[PDB]
Amino acid sequence: KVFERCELARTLKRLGMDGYRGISLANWMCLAKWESGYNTRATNYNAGDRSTDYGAFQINSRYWCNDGKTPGAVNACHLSCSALLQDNIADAVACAKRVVRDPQGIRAWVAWRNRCQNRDVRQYVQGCGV
């Protein structure tokens, strides 16, 4: 499913993402935007290390979810990577919360550093009523 901007913004707020571990809702929106374009079925294979990024937040199979074919992989979210491809983003949100519970926080995603850090992210939530 490809979410519309404000639709996703409201859903994330309902799931308690606003201010989670100090991360504002606009930052989560900036991350989803650049990672997948708000697309829950997005997958990207990383030929260089044999891991795959899954879903709206592009969560990696080496550390977060299990897809069975990633070498030396752990499953910190204790989920099948398949769960991160559903239209209902509840599981992907719970796993995203787990990722930011690590010391790096939101910095765990390189795209956040490149496209969101130190920038005016208000545009991602403006007019959505959140």
Helix/strand/coil (H/E/C) assignment for every residue in the chain = CECCHHHHHHHHHHCCCCCECCECHHHHHHHHHHHHCCECCCEEEECCCCEEEECCCCEECCCCCECCCCCCCCCCCCCEHHHHHCCCCHHHHHHHHHHCCCCCHHHHCHHHHHHCCCCCCHHHCCCCCC
Residues 6+ apart with CB under 8 A from 76: 63, 64, 98, 99
CA distances from 114 to 40, 77, 100, 105, 108 (A): 22, 25, 17, 15, 12
- How many C-beta atoms surround the C-beta of residue 19 within 10 A? 11
- How many C-beta atoms surround the C-beta of residue 81 within 10 A? 25
Does the annotation mark 53 as catalytic? yes
- Say if CB 85 and CB 43 are below 8 A apart: yes
Full strand arrangement of the beta sheet holding 43-46? 43-46, 51-54, 59-60
**Which CATH number fits the domain that encloses residue 111?**
1.10.530.10
Instruction: Give the residue numbers spanning the domain of 90.
Output: 1-130
Sign of CA dihedral 127, 27, 110, 85: negative
5-14 helix and 25-36 helix, angle to the nearest 10 degrees: 130
User: How many whole angstroms separate alpha carbon 25 and alpha carbon 121?
Assistant: 10
Does the annotation mark 91 as catalytic? no
CA distances from 107 to 2, 23, 99, 101 (A): 24, 11, 10, 11
- Say if CB 101 and CB 20 are below 8 A apart: no
Per the residue annotation, which of 7, 53, 67, 120 is the catalytic one?
53
User: How many whole angstroms separate alpha carbon 112 and alpha carbon 117?
Assistant: 6
Per the residue annotation, which of 35, 49, 67, 120 is the catalytic one?
35
**How many domains does the chain divide into?**
1
